[PDB]
Amino acid sequence: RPYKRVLIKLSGGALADQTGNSFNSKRLEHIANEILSIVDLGIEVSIVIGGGNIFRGHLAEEWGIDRVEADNIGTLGTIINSLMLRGVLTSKTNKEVRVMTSIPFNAVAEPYIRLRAVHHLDNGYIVIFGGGNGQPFVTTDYPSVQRAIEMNSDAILVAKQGVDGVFTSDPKHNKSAKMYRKLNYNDVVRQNIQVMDQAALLLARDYNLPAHVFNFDEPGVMRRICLGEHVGTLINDDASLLVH
Template identity: 55%
Template sequence: MYERIVIKLSGQAIAGGAGFGFDSTSLTHLATEVLAARATGVQVAVVVGGGNVFRGNRAEEWGIDRVEADNIGMLGTVINAVLLRGRLTALGATDVRLMTAIPINNLAEPYIRLRALRHLEKGSVVILACGNGQPFTTTDYPAVQRAIELDADALLVAKNGTDGVYDADPNRVPTAERFDRLSYADVIARGLNVMDQSAFILARDHRLPLHVFDIDARSAATAICKGEPIGTLIS
């Protein structure tokens, strides 16, 4: 059983089936899953994406440069993080800490590694927003980075509607097979699309286990925390 985990939640998971914007039912489900994982006794941090609000790779479409677009995307993660904090609190959690890589003092604490570790040790759910505060990265990289910084036992990569890593796109290839377990070398050799390559290489170099699973599946994160073989484990 793990003692400390980081869960990477995409903005799309907050948007639900729409893929953009916000869905109240999906938000409640995500918050419930986070609290259920923590109820197992595991320390939980959550890195939130912002793709349901704005994606930095749409810079050209909007006629702005990539740095500005990524800044907007980071602000999108803050919106999602505040929403998640609000729903966690509404569900009865009184010890939720929101930390941002870019200082937004009226809404959140600045991310300070030692302070985040202290919050986790006290049993608080720690939500991490703004990625790592730098442009030209998706939230995959800071999710791995924060997991390593916080000495997490594993990173849970929550997918929306996909229950693991397959040898082909299961939405297009009905015969696609899901892997229960892979090594880092297997993923690279097969050219499997798990996350951004730079993030994956960072996880490999620091031997950070990755659990790729479907966040829509009830109690999946809890089962992983208990050591059950859910989704795909990359180690």
């Protein structure tokens, strides 16, 4: 469909090359351009970023840091990325971009407030959500679908980086994995498909939020999706299809 309000979910990994780590101005420029391409059509955007380029559980395990404790750390990463992204975004747009946090940091970002968030979006601002949900045991996926629904979003675009959609089985291997053009919710859980949190998926299904999994790394594809093109995978309550 032609969406008017959208929620883009970005992995923290997308902001960094893979090499050393952190940020990579070539990657931040790509991200910014892809984002501005949508807003330029007057679509209202909310962005939820992960903190993967800063902090990983790989280290929490190493020092046996309590899971709730490792999540708090990783959450701060998301706020660092949100703040960065805003810098990059402001440089290229003249639109207002607001960073809202689930852990009010104030004088760093605005404490997150729903109706305020809706308000901004309505006023045509770009809003960025940091610190996800504020809760533990959860991935970037869940909070992001939760905010999408809270913000009366039309769709959630879940940006991937090199994987062009959702496949039957991991193509990084199997001669023949096929990619879904369409994918049912219940069908994803049934065939235990491993694309996004189950909890996120369920919520999205419960509220009828559609999701698009696609290649963020490929220029233009997020615009084509918003423009109505069928690129990548669409997760719906429609009945499953499959590229040909």
